[PDB]
Design a protein around this nucleic acid. Structure first.
Ligand code: NA
Ligand code: NA
Length: 327
DNA sequence: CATCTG
DNA sequence: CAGATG
């Protein structure tokens, strides 16, 4: 956790680059198990050979650990940090909509910067376009104080459109969090479930409403169950308008809301443990359901849930306020 | 995993 | 349809 930190860190830089700049999924994947295991390792790696001993730990990695241990630095790490091409890739990639893939294509064409991008607005698709237009807002965190105004709106409109709609704002926003990066709304309706064959309307009506009143600004992706947008809290009495915020809305069958809700609320760590405990308790849990574990190895059949409560109960645990869902 | 692009 | 992005 801090005893093999540098190592796990350098290793992470290295892994990343393979994947992002080169295409080295294998190598990349290589640096990764490596960093994971060294990360788990209980002592202070005092040398290459020492590490090598570990699984995932091969000869070049070892070599590398050696040089790093030997001197506070690594050549290759130094070479990669300079290289403009690599840097570009890391940069372009910050644009919502631009993945590494594309980052390569553009760089090869010479688009390496933000201006470059503007100039070549033709080469960008809609998503990327938006992404470019709100690069700044996009990277700005979302203060919970805004979150509340947001939440306040979305819920009011959802309500208007149907009394029967059930919306929830998952995310850290839900676990306490003083700020967040994006707005995540879980949605369901009684009239939509596991079997129930579809009802796209269910998701479309709301999106519509949201744009009606102007909260939703642009559409990133709009499917029959998952919508990806941009929204903005009305600029009051002109002098201070807000940044544009990423926002997502997803329809869920009513018969798997809470597991979802639970699920998305996090944290990853909370999940796991909960997940693990469920397991002891003779159960299973994933994004959509909780299932009674048979003995033949495994086995299923969806337990019936009406709240986050029903869930815990099953695994016979202490109902946790979302705040304390931390770890 | 769901949506998009091409 | 394969392949990309989130
Ligand atoms: Na990006
Ligand atoms: Na292939």
């Amino acid at each position: 956790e801090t005893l093999n930190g540098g190592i796990t860190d350098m290793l992470t830089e290295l892994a990343n680059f393979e994947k992002n700049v080169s295409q080295a999924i294998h190598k990349y994947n290589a640096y990764r198990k490596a960093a994971s295991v060294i990360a788990k390792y209980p002592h202070k790696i005092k040398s290459g050979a020492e590490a090598k001993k570990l699984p995932g730990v091969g000869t070049k990695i070892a070599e590398k650990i050696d040089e790093f241990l030997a001197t506070g630095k690594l050549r290759k790490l130094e070479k990669i940090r300079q290289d403009d091409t690599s840097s570009s890739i890391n940069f372009l990639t910050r644009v919502s909509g631009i993945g590494p893939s594309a980052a390569r294509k553009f760089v090869d064409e010479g688009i390496k910067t933000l201006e470059d991008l503007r100039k070549n607005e033709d080469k960008l698709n809609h998503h990327q376009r938006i992404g470019l237009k709100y690069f700044g807002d996009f990277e700005k965190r979302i203060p919970r104080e805004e979150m509340l105004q947001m939440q306040d709106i979305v819920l009011n409109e959802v309500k208007k459109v149907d009394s029967e709609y059930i919306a929830t704002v998952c995310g850290s926003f839900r676990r306490g969090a003083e700020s967040s990066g994006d707005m995540d709304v879980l949605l369901t309706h009684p009239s939509f479930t596991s079997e129930s064959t579809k009802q796209p309307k269910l998701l479309h009506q709301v999106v519509e409403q949201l744009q009606k009143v102007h909260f939703i600004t642009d559409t990133l992706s709009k499917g029959e169950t998952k919508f990806m947008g941009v929204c903005q809290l009305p600029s009051k009495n002109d002098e201070k308008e807000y940044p544009h915020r990423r926002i997502d809305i997803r329809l869920i069958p009513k018969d798997q809301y809470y597991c979802g809700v639970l699920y998305f609320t996090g944290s990853d760590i909370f999940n796991k443990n909960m997940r693990a405990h469920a397991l002891e308790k003779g159960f299973t849990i994933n994004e959509y359901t909780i299932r009674p574990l048979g003995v033949t190895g495994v086995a299923g059949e969806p337990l019936p849930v009406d709240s986050e409560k029903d869930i815990f109960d099953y695994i016979q645990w202490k109902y946790r306020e979302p705040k304390d869902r931390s770890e």
